[PDB]
Amino acid sequence: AESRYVLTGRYDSAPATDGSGTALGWTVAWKNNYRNAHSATTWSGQYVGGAEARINTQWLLTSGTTEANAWKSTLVGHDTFTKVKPSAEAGITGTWYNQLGSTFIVTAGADGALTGTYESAVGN
Amino acid sequence: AESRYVLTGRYDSAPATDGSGTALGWTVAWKNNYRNAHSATTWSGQYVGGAEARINTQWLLTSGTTEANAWKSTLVGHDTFTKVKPAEAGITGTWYNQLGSTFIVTAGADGALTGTYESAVGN
Amino acid sequence: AESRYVLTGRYDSAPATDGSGTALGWTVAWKNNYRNAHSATTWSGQYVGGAEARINTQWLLTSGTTEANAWKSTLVGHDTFTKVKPSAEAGITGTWYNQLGSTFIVTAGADGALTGTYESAVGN
Amino acid sequence: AESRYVLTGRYDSAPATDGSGTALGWTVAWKNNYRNAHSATTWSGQYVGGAEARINTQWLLTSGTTEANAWKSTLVGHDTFTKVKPAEAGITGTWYNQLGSTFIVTAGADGALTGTYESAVGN
Numbered sequence A, C: 001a002e003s004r005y006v007l008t009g010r011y012d013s014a015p016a017t018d019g020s021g022t023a024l025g026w027t028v029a030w031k032n033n034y035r036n037a038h039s040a041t042t043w044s045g046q047y048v049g050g051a052e053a054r055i056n057t058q059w060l061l062t063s064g065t066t067e068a069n070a071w072k073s074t075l076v077g078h079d080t081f082t083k084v085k086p087s088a089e090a091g092i093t094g095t096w097y098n099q100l101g102s103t104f105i106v107t108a109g110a111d112g113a114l115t116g117t118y119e120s121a122v123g124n
Numbered sequence B, D: 001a002e003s004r005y006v007l008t009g010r011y012d013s014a015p016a017t018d019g020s021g022t023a024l025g026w027t028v029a030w031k032n033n034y035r036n037a038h039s040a041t042t043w044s045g046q047y048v049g050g051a052e053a054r055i056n057t058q059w060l061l062t063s064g065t066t067e068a069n070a071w072k073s074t075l076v077g078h079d080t081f082t083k084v085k086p087a088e089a090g091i092t093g094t095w096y097n098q099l100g101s102t103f104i105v106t107a108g109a110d111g112a113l114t115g116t117y118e119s120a121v122g123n
């Protein structure tokens, strides 16, 4: 769909069981079959499980630029994701929304893979 | 392999018709069959082609932490990759950064990045 | 005092009056007359005025390292500051606390200067 | 001066007795008597002394935005400074980064950084 973009990423599929979060990250390149922003975002963060599951992230959004403009190519920010209807695999897998109203649909594989789609409330 | 970790990511497979760079990113979770650092790095940047191609990145390395220690969970840095080992034109290939880490990547026609990463530091 | 560190920074002393925040930043080097962490944090952000005044920031915390360890010298994060008892000068000047329970006492000067003290709830 | 902006910051004035670098940071708000970009940059990094001294930094450039646009308010990058114009040992002096910007700084004995910054880009 016009609003959805592919994501792929990785997570720690054998996380510590000592109270620590589960490290993960993913990337969206902002091209789909409808639009192309010539940019890519990576989110790096951790999954915090339980009934009030969260994925807390920081992100880097790099736009393709000329070399002369490369100094201003990368935005930084932070997103917190809340799971709709809340193992790390089962914990992460599902639909999530962030504070902007963006939506993150993800499946976590047994091998550490993250796959899914992202819809941003802003940009593009 | 002991020192290699899986990566995946995405890149702009139809970059602007105008001298831009090609936006991209990828992730490594630092677990393999030998070690687990309970952490993940994402690199965000752009590929700059030509005679001496480069991938210029900034990265975020998040470690799993308690919520109380989350304030100190994330390192930030910057890596520049070239194909010079301390080659065909394009992103696909073997790249090395300023630390001597090895990034071996395949770029699929429709935007996928897949490969392996071997870090010269950490773990 | 043992818990307090000097800060200095700068703010836009003639900000846009079009709904935009007021850009600012400051630095703490984590040495006082009691402790030295051999590190420094910079906060970069904006002041959002009104009765529910906020300073929203991202920060970089660099520790002194050897060259071999420089790759792991810098932490990144984000702090949101709430004003205790809420011009940009008057708006910014006061006592603020962040989500960690740290406290930021600042005076904004007519020339764009920020001066004050910082007490961190964590680290050191 | 038209192209110079005020900076202040702080540095560790008693760095570790052990080969560390000296942690430091500074801020420029991009308002002077000529222009106002409604933005501020902070540089966080460390000074590495010796024969060819360096200040290695990462920076955050926040622009004043509406709250709705705050997600895109902050650029991040990295600057490396040397004293080579495109000198006495220490932080105090005139430094240049890879963009050709000029950072003129005085380091006070007890941790103050003061000076001016002229950017080769932006504004």
Ligand SMILES: O=C(O)CCCC[C@@H]1SC[C@@H]2NC(=O)N[C@@H]21
Binding pocket: A030, A037, A038, A039, A040, A041, A059, A061, A063, A077, A079, A098, A100, A102, A119, A120, A121, A122, A123, A124, D071
């Ligand atoms: O405009 C672009 O270049 C592409 C869209 C970027 C949207 C960003 S990604 C980080 C932040 N979190 C979101 O959910 N949306 C924005």
Ligand SMILES: O=C(O)CCCC[C@@H]1SC[C@@H]2NC(=O)N[C@@H]21
Binding pocket: B030, B037, B038, B039, B040, B041, B059, B061, B063, B077, B079, B097, B099, B101, B118, B119, B120, B121, B122, B123, C071
């Ligand atoms: O120690 C860890 O938590 C995992 C290894 C991290 C290595 C980092 S990733 C960013 C930087 N670039 C590299 O090539 N290595 C380091």
Ligand SMILES: O=C(O)CCCC[C@@H]1SC[C@@H]2NC(=O)N[C@@H]21
Binding pocket: B071, C030, C037, C038, C039, C040, C041, C059, C061, C063, C077, C079, C098, C100, C102, C119, C120, C121, C122, C123, C124
């Ligand atoms: O441990 C250190 O190296 C010095 C103290 C660092 C405390 C950091 S600064 C960013 C974050 N916000 C706070 O209020 N405290 C932490």
Ligand SMILES: O=C(O)CCCC[C@@H]1SC[C@@H]2NC(=O)N[C@@H]21
Binding pocket: A071, D030, D037, D038, D039, D040, D041, D059, D061, D063, D077, D079, D097, D099, D101, D118, D119, D120, D121, D122, D123
């Ligand atoms: O355009 C602006 O908002 C103000 C000028 C910003 C210039 C930036 S600061 C980080 C980077 N390093 C430099 O020397 N210049 C750019």
